[PDB]
Ligand binder design. Structure first.
Ligand SMILES: O/N=C(\Nc1ccccc1)c1cccc(C(F)(F)F)c1
Ligand SMILES: [Mg+2]
Lengths: 104, 50, 69, 1340, 452
């Protein structure tokens, strides 16, 4: 209902301002804290079909371009496996009780 | 056409002769570019069958 | 004809590749068809060694071990 | 002769005088849009027309009407430059007056109230640049002209392939500009059928019934009448004597006591003549002849009131009896002949399932919208709404015109809808074609091919916006309260604005201008496309439409078309071509009246040109211009042959008009095979500009036109003397004759300086004029990129030798001397725009601050306190342009990392480094930085520095304006005051500000003083308002996307020179890729000791037949000869006489050319400069097909001191020994296309990966791996290599496990693979199993 | 998964699945509320439609995705894929450890190698480089190794020279047709961004030099190295699999070289003299005393292996030219002098390699071919062959042929004017005379150009 309420104002104010109300303009018109315009206006958007075609009409579709950011680079994982050998080596360099206490 | 190209490339070709050569050119490019696709399709069918 | 002969293939995974996928999958799914691989296309699809060339040694060694003691 | 022509003149071979000179090349683009947005006080196309169409909008019966008054386009929010920098669209607000009237309920019509809402705003429509371009987002964009099937009626064949019985078929098609298609077609049974759009087939007559025609009137329409009389008793007949043609006597034909024809004797022209001259109106026929004859109208029994026979029924000997005894004297029958007049419609009725109008309407409505129950009002509404509604249907003007014309009508203009007469006429014509009289048209003809352009299309999209606003207005006017709402609350902004924005922003015809090159620009702006909306597709249409047609002559260039997926679906516009009044393509011609060739020009369209006989561009006439030979090669109707002396109606205007600006720029084109010429004109558009714009040494004479007409250069608005010349600006003092009385004046040209182009090349203007120089109106003030002194230089000509050099030239390969890379001539300047975005995450806002986790002092050095790189700082790959950091909290580390941090006491930051760094390997100098900020967020340090700087620069510039202007005006006041009251020394003493008080004796000069006063003060305040406006435009926070707080754009200028791997080509379609860059030491040299720049492989010359590239070489050498000689005589400093002599000698050249020449030119100051400009080489113009000849070239070589062969002795720079045989050396113009090798080059080891299916994907512009396809797989399969293939499709790509497990082994020194299963197939399993299909992996 | 600007993007299946859920749940509700039949039926049909749309869309109504006209992609469309019949193995797959670029010549190369841009080889072999850097202990850890090669420290180039040596790379061109479309080469580190490709191989790839690009792939696993070297290697395919004829046949410049080399003019320096052997024949030529082509008798020693696995030798005075004499130095062992004594056209120069292969075996044929290429390029370069505008000779009799043939057409035309011949027969006649004329001019210019 809030979103709709914003739309209503944006309609008159579209030609009334001759350009369009500033992003903070509809904010004063509305009751609440008014910085909420950004959040509400953003979250209100509908997700884009991951099958949305881009370029060439070719089978390249939007979803094909979305990379995995949750993965871990091999150039790193190698250094994890290496760091194991590192700290494991250096933990053989102290007394067994210092080693036990540090590994603990 | 019953009036061939009487000139050649060492000499100049006039407007008409060149305009008439153009069709042969475009049909050449089109035909070859198509025969590439035909060849490919054929190899496809072939490796599929073997 | 070649395009006709390519139609019949024991392996359904192979057929699903170059033929009409939907029909092949259904028509195989009813008979409970069991794909044994044994071919190139299917092995490429499933991502293991090609039953030819360098790989021919492997598959052979596997093919004879199969249906045997 | 002009002023920059005195600087340099191009020696022009060729004979044919130019009767007409090349027009404005940008014509189409500007004219179209000029028509779109404009005020036209009538229905002629424009915003006015599109308004008058959908308007006025009345509600549904409610008598609340909204009409349209007038519209206006407000001044642009930002001008072109600012709009380019900021990134917004160059557009004007559309303000339209609407009038809302409310009629008193239960009228005579009168209004309760009418509110006129002043100019409600709908949308902002984009504006076209003076150069015919649009700026959508900060980017110059061109909308390609479209080529489609012209609206009207069209008759086709479809012989052959259908049914394989031959017999052809005949179909007509009515194609409206808007609305449904109406198709008519025959079938193998000769039954006429009709289909609306592509829909279900219906028997033709079923439409006629819907027009309210009973069967009797259909027969009455399509067939003639055979009259039968029963007079006395037993069967007479009316006979039109022509009816007996093509038929054999079925009985004794006798009348008037004289027997004209016996039984079994076919009736020929003799019998017919006899009957005609003996005038036999009525003859006696047997009762059995009507056994086949079909009755025309209905027949009833007068007494019993019962139907004897229905209309269109076959009579029998018994039926005749039953209608005879009823007292019927007359029987009307159809006139039917299986040869001449066909019995088609009659048999069409027998396949017609319907009876009356309502029946037909039912079968039509159920055809268009099937499955749903039909209604009377529904069928009527639909059928009336299809072709008969002013709303849903238009052929417009072109449509109505072609329609009426093709129907052999008189009226060239008429209603925009269909009439019963129209449909009936079309059917009649189709039947006439099936009957043998008349022919079918063809689609490829350019009379059936219509040309749209930006304006028309934009009009269409705006129209669509207006219909979707119409629905809204009616929807609101449904429930409305009287005086509260007004024409604002209804009409929205977004719908129209998004219609137009969706057009210019994304459309197959809307594309980024290709600006790497003036030729590229100008050849893009003239372009045609049969693709896009309302056009065909590559997949759809075959070779017929792609192919060159005889009608393409002089209209579309035969040799310039793309070579690829779409060939001939584009082409290009010809040189002299123009859009026809109706929108067709017409070409210039010379009218030959009687036996004289008149120089009067005449423009002929595709259909206009058809019947006339047209002469050749190449022909021999003399004196009065009478044809020398008794017969000359000409083309009349669709073909070319020898034609008699005086037959010819017309003649070609130019030797050029067949080709296009691109093809017209190829010298010695006549000597090149069409394929290679095509490729040549195709690649010439790809030439990247060079650092020093050179000039073509070998040329055409079009280059001047291409240079000037394209906006790359800066042309004088008015003539005068240059007051000031700077690398920044140029100020010209206007002559009084060209000058307006008020404001006095000077014309100030602000030059474009180094800035980003669309292709990321450098676009920069340089002044070609010097301080205090005379300039003429229409003269080049400053050259753009790749233009020299008003001509077009797309590259640099150079010394070339044809000979194999150690295989380094092997295929097309090019071998280039080090002298070239050292001279920095083929060097190129690239301008790249890199961006940095500061977004908003739930974790926090991103900072542009210079405080960056994990960077050395060397890293943070090149950045200021604010985090942005300094202007002018040279950077390379990895350098930080803009420091940026985004919050990521709580890293969540592991045990050994925790121990590590414990020992080394490091605080692992809550912030991650997002900073924009120069992409790998690219290196250049920073020429600019821009900072966009959300309106309301505090501008940072650097951005503020920038704002103050820009402010001061603005004030300085505006002040300069006002100063030069004011001085210019007061200098005029000083001059006018001196007439009638001259005081010379007295006037300039007192302060200049106090001058305006002093008057003058009675005269118009007092009123001139008045004028200068008014305009003075006008400028004075205009400065003020302009300054205020500029300041506000600087300070306003630009509106950005959601989530982005601020954006920093850095502009890098990289200078790349030339390296092996770069693509190079001549204008002749000869490609090459530089192989080795060889030392000047190893270069083949001549006896004089002068090395050669490039060594071309001769083997490339014979096979691909382009012989022009050789001629171009030869003449080129010759040209250089004329240069060298002069270079010596200038270095001799002989005197003006010797130089003048030699130059004139050059400019004459032995006989019969059209050039003329000097000594009208000032013998000292002007001549020496010309000689100075010629010393590099002597520029030559070879007209396209009018170009030079071997003899002329050899003669110029005689003047050169150089051999006739064009070949000399060359010595290997290595052994110093000679080369057997002479080798061809000369000067070839060579282009650097931008394929440049450090763009194309890519490599990847282990990069990012796609989420949906785990596969290699570039996310960093760190490129995704190469795609290994099916064919490559087969290639691996032919070899015995299993492991290469497995590793190819498993570990190197698709295996999320195997890839890393591989990497660790690759570093460990163990080469193996533990493959696992590719994730693609593993996903496919889930996809299959997601259905009701169980797919399992068995056994072990 | 989320995007930039806080926007979201998702597969269409959700839109589909969601529907199937909703309606399904609604149906359950309509059961517990005891709805009339007409309602629950409609709900059942709707559920059927939703499920159908989910599984395979387009077999009933073709439902459209939210706010977007384009029909939403269903599971059957997920399986089928597109570009005709391609299942993501079939169309292609992105692959790590690979690259590509514009290609250039590199005639200096042996047939078994290829020029590889330094930077490309650096980025390609990166993991190998990392492992080798800390194998010798030049880098403390893998991280430090990365920092080293990323800094491009001078020491890494030599390590790259190590990891490159015995380690073949696969080269591929765009239109792969037969198996020769991919071939293995030994990498040669080369400054510059272009790939260098041996000329003799340019035939197999159908690769011009006009800007065609080639792709490189690294054979990671040991088995891939040995597969590449023993199968996909350049030297291991010298023959087309289609027919036993050599695909390594010299292309253009080289054959013009050998052609210009062994050929003879009528009179030239050194004509008629005699020399001890090919050595002093070349010595005669380079010093400028004797012409490259002149009729000369020289003593040669040829070989025939015609004994049993054994090379016979025989010496004689052969009547040959200077060029053929010089060229003979290259021809290995058991080949007869008869093979080089001819004019050496593109056809004969192929049968040379062929006979060499069917006689001496693989290795000699390889090295022979290489030598033939080198000498071809060299001597062709020496020859100073070129093309001028006067190199193309038009017959002197052309205009006359044109004129007579032009008389013929006006003759047949005059016959058509008088009705002596029908239109079609006329057409055929005129066309025949013009064709014949063309043949005449062709066989004029052929004689003049050829023997004059
Ligand atoms: O004599 N024939 C022709 N002469 C001819 C010459 C110039 C322009 C137009 C026609 C001819 C007739 C049809 C089609 C073609 C074309 F397009 F292929 F060049 C050429
Ligand atoms: Mg090529």
């Amino acid at each position: 209902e809030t979103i709709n309420k914003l739309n209503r104002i944006s309609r008159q104010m579209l030609q009334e301002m001759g350009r369009e109300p500033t992003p903070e303009e509809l904010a004063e018109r509305m009751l609440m804290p008014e910085d909420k315009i950004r959040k509400v206006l953003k979250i209100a958007k509908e997700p884009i079909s991951m099958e949305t075609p881009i370029g060439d009409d070719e089978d390249s579709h939007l979803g094909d371009f979305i990379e995995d950011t949750t993965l871990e680079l091999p150039l790193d994982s190698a250094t994890t496996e290496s760091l194991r050998a590192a700290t494991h080596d250096v933990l053989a360099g102290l007394t067994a009780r210092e080693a036990k206490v540090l590994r603990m | 056409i019953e009036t061939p190209i009487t000139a050649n490339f060492r000499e100049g070709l006039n407007v008409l002769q060149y305009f008439i050569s153009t069709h042969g050119a475009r049909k050449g490019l089109a035909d070859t570019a198509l025969k590439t696709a035909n060849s490919g399709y054929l190899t496809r069918r072939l490796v599929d069958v073997a | 004809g070649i395009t006709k002969a390519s139609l019949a293939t024991e392996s359904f995974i192979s057929a699903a590749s170059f033929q009409e996928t939907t029909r092949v999958l259904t028509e195989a799914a009813v008979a409970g068809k069991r794909d044994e691989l044994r071919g190139l296309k299917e092995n490429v699809i499933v991502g293991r060694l090609i039953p030819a060339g360098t790989g021919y040694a492997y598959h052979q060694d596997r093919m004879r071990r199969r249906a045997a003691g | 002769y002009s002023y920059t022509e005195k600087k340099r003149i191009r020696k022009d071979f060729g004979k044919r005088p130019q009767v007409l000179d090349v027009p404005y090349l940008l014509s189409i683009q500007l004219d179209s849009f000029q028509k779109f947005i404009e005020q036209d006080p009538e229905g002629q196309y424009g915003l006015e027309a599109a308004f008058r169409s959908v308007f006025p909008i009345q509600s549904y019966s409610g008598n609340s009407e909204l009409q349209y008054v007038s519209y206006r386009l407000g001044e642009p929010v930002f001008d072109v430059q600012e709009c380019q920098i900021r990134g917004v669209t160059y557009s004007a607000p559309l303000r339209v007056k609407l009038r809302l009237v409310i009629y008193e309920r239960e009228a005579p019509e009168g209004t309760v109230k009418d509110i006129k809402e002043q100019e409600v705003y709908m949308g902002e429509i984009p504006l076209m640049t003076d150069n015919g371009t649009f700026v959508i987002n900060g980017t110059e964009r061109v909308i390609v002209s479209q080529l489609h099937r012209s609206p009207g009626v069209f008759f086709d064949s479809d012989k052959g392939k259908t049914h394989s019985s031959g017999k052809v078929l005949y179909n007509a098609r009515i194609i409206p500009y808007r609305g449904s298609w109406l198709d008519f077609e025959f079938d193998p049974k000769d039954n006429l059928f009709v289909r609306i759009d592509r829909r279900r087939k219906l028997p033709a007559t079923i439409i006629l019934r819907a027009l309210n025609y009973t069967t009797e009137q259909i027969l009455d329409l399509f067939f003639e009448k055979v009259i039968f009389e029963i007079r006395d008793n037993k069967l007479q007949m009316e006979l039109v004597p022509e009816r007996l043609r093509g038929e054999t006597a079925s009985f004794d034909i006798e009348a008037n006591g004289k027997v004209y024809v016996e039984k079994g004797r076919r009736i020929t022209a003799r019998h017919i003549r006899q009957l005609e001259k003996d005038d036999v109106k009525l003859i006696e026929v047997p009762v059995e002849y009507i056994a086949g004859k079909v009755v025309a109208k209905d027949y009833i029994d007068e007494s019993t009131g019962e139907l004897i026979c229905a209309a269109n029924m076959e009579l029998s000997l018994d039926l005749l009896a039953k209608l005879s005894q009823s007292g019927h004297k007359r029987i009307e029958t159809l006139f039917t002949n299986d040869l001449d007049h066909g019995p088609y419609i009659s048999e069409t009725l027998r396949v017609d399932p319907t009876n009356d109008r309502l029946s037909a309407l039912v079968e039509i409505y159920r055809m268009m919208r099937p499955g749903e129950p039909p209604t009377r009002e529904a069928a009527e509404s639909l059928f009336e709404n299809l072709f008969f509604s002013e709303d849903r249907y238009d052929l417009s003007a072109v449509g109505r015109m072609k329609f009426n014309r093709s129907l052999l009508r008189e009226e060239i203009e008429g209603s925009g809808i269909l009439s019963k007469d129209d449909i009936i006429d079309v059917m009649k014509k189709l039947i006439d074609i099936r009957n043998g009289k008349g022919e079918v048209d063809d689609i490829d003809h350019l009379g059936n091919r219509r040309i749209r352009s930006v304006g028309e299309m934009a009009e269409n999209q705006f129209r669509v916006g207006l219909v979707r606003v119409e629905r809204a207005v009616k929807e609101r006017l449904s429930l409305g309260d009287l005086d509260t709402l007004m024409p604002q609350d209804m009409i929205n902004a977004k719908p129209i604005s998004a219609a137009v924005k969706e057009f210019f922003g994304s459309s197959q015809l809307s594309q980024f201008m290709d600006q790497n090159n003036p030729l590229s620009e100008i050849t893009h702006k003239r372009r045609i496309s049969a693709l896009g909306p309302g056009g065909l597709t590559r997949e759809r249409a075959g070779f017929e439409v792609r192919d060159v047609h005889p009608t393409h002559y002089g209209r579309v260039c035969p040799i310039e078309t793309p070579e690829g997926p779409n060939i001939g679906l584009i082409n290009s516009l010809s040189v002299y071509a123009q859009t026809n009044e109706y929108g067709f393509l017409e070409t210039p011609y010379r009218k030959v009246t009687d036996g004289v060739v008149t120089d009067e020009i005449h423009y002929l369209s595709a259909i206009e040109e058809g019947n006339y006989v047209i002469a050749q561009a190449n022909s021999n006439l003399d004196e009065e211009g009478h044809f020398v030979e008794d017969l000359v090669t000409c083309r009349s109707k669709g073909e070319s042959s020898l034609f008699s002396r005086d037959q010819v109606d017309y003649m070609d205007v130019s030797t050029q008009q067949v080709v296009s600006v691109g093809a017209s720029l190829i010298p010695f084109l006549e000597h090149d095979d069409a394929n290679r010429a095509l490729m040549g004109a195709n690649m010439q558009r790809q030439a990247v500009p060079t650092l020093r714009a050179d000039k073509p040494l070998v040329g055409t004479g079009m280059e001047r036109a291409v240079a000037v007409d394209s906006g790359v250069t800066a042309v004088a608005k008015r003539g005068g003397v240059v007051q000031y010349v700077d690398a920044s600006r140029i100020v010209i003092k206007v002559n009084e004759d060209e000058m307006y009385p008020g404001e006095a004046g000077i014309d100030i040209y602000n030059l474009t300086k180094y800035t980003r182009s669309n292709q990321n090349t450098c676009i920069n203007q340089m002044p070609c004029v010097s301080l205090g120089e005379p300039v003429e109106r229409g003269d080049v003030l400053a050259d753009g990129p790749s233009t020299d002194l008003g001509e077009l230089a797309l590259g640099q000509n150079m010394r070339v030798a044809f000979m194999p050099w150690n295989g380094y030239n092997f295929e097309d390969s090019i071998l280039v001397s080090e002298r070239v890379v050292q001279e920095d001539r083929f060097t190129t300047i690239h301008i790249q725009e890199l961006a940095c975005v500061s977004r908003d995450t739930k974790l926090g806002p991103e900072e542009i601050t210079a405080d960056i986790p994990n960077v050395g002092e060397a890293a943070l050095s090149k950045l200021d306190e604010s985090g942005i790189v300094y202007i002018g700082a040279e950077v390379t790959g990895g350098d930080i342009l803009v420091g940026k950091v985004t919050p990521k909290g709580e890293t969540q580390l592991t045990p050994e990392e925790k121990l590590l941090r414990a020992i080394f006491g490091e605080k692992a930051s809550d912030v991650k480094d997002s900073s924009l760094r120069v992409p790998n390997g690219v290196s250049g100098t920073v020429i600019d930085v821009q900072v966009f900020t959300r309106d309301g967020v505090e501008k940072d340090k650097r951005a503020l520095e920038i704002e103050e700087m820009q402010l001061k620069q603005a004030k300085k510039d505006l002040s300069e304006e006002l100063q030069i202007l004011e001085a210019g005006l007061f200098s005029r006041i000083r001059a006018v005051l001196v007439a009638g009251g001259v005081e010379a020394e007295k006037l300039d003493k007192l302060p200049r500000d106090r001058w305006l008080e002093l008057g003058l004796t009675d005269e118009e000069k007092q009123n001139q003083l008045e004028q200068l006063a008014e305009q003075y003060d006008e400028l004075k305040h205009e400065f003020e308002k302009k300054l205020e406006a500029k300041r506000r435009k600087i300070t306003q926070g630009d509106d950005l996307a959601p989530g982005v707080l601020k954006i920093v754009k850095v502009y890098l200028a990289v200078k790349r020179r030339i390296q092996p791997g770069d693509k190079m080509a001549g204008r002749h379609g000869n490609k090459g890729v530089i192989s080795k860059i060889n030392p000047i030491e190893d270069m083949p040299y001549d006896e004089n000791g002068t090395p050669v720049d490039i060594v071309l492989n001769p083997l490339g010359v014979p096979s691909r037949m382009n012989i022009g590239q050789i001629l171009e070489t030869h003449l080129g050498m010759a040209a250089k000869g004329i240069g060298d000689k002069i270079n010596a005589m200038l270095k001799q400093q002989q005197e003006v006489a010797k130089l003048r002599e030699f130059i004139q000698r050059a400019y004459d050249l032995g006989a019969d050319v059209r050039q003329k020449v000097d000594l009208s030119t000032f013998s000292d100051e002007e001549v020496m400069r010309l000689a100075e400009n010629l010393r590099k080489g002597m520029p030559i113009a070879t007209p396209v097909f009018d170009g030079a000849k071997e003899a002329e070239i050899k003669e110029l070589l005689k003047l050169g001191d150089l051999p006739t062969s064009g070949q000399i002795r060359l010595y290997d720079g290595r052994t110093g020994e000679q080369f057997e045989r002479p080798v061809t050396v000369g000067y070839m113009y060579m282009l650097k296309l931008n394929h440049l090798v450090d763009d194309k080059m890519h490599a990847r080891s282990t990069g990012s990966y796609s989420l949906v299916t785990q596969q290699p994907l570039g996310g960093k512009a760190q490129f995704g791996g190469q795609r290994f396809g099916e064919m490559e797989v087969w290639a691996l399969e032919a070899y015995g290599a299993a492991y290469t293939l497995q590793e190819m499709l498993t570990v190197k790509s698709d295996d999320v496990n195997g890839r890393t497990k591989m990497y660790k082994n690759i570093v460990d020194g163990n080469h193996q693979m533990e493959p696992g299963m590719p994730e693609s197939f593993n996903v496919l399993l889930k996809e299959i199993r997601s259905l009701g299909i169980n797919i399992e992996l068995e056994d072990e | 998964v989320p995007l930039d600007g806080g926007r979201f993007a998702t597969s269409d299946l959700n839109d589909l699945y969601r529907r199937v859920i909703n309606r399904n749940n609604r149906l359950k509700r309509l059961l517990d509320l005891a709805a009339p039949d007409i309602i629950v039926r409609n709900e059942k049909r709707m559920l059927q439609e939703a499920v159908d749309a989910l599984l395979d869309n387009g077999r009933r109504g073709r439902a459209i995705t939210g706010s977007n006209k384009r029909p939403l992609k269903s599971l059957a469309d997920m399986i089928k894929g597109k570009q005709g019949r391609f299942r993501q193995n079939l169309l292609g797959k992105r692959v790590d450890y690979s690259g590509r670029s514009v290609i250039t010549v590199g005639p200096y190369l042996r047939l078994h190698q290829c020029g590889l841009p330094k930077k490309m080889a650096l980025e390609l072999f990166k993991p190998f480089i990392y492992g080798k850097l800390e194998l010798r202990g030049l880098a403390t850890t893998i991280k430090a190794a990365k920092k080293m090669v990323e800094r491009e420290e001078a020491v890494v180039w030599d390590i790259l020279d190590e990891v490159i040596r015995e380690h073949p790379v696969l080269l591929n061109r765009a239109p792969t047709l037969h198996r020769l479309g991919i071939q293995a080469f030994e990498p040669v580190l080369i400054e510059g961004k272009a790939i260098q490709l041996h000329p003799l191989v340019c035939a197999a790839y159908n690769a011009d030099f006009d800007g065609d690009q080639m792709a490189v792939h690294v054979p990671l696993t040991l088995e891939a190295q040995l597969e590449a070297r023993a199968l996909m290697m350049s030297t291991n395919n010298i023959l087309s699999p289609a027919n036993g004829e050599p695909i390594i046949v010299p292309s253009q410049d080289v054959v013009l070289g050998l052609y210009y080399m062994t050929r003879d003019c009528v009179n030239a320096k050194g004509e008629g003299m005699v020399l001890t052997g090919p050595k002093e024949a070349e010595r005669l030529y380079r010093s400028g005393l004797a012409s490259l082509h002149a009729r000369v008798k020289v003593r040669i020693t040829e070989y025939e292996k015609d004994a049993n696995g054994e090379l016979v030798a025989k010496t004689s005075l052969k009547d040959t030219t200077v060029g053929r004499a010089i060229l003979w130095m290259i021809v290995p062992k058991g080949l007869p002098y008869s093979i080089v004594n001819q004019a050496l056209g593109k056809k004969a120069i192929s049968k040379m390699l062929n006979t060499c292969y069917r006689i001496l075996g693989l290795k000699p044929t390889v090295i022979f071919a290489d030598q033939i290429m080198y000498t071809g390029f060299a001597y062709a370069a020496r020859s100073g062959a070129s093309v001028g505008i006067d190199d193309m000779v038009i017959p002197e009799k052309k205009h006359e042929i044109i004129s007579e043939a032009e008389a013929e057409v006006a003759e047949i035309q005059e016959q058509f004017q008088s009705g002596l011949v029908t239109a079609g027969e006329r057409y055929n006649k005129v066309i025949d005379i013009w064709a014949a004329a063309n043949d005449r001019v062709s066989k004029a210019m052929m004689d003049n150009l050829q023997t004059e």
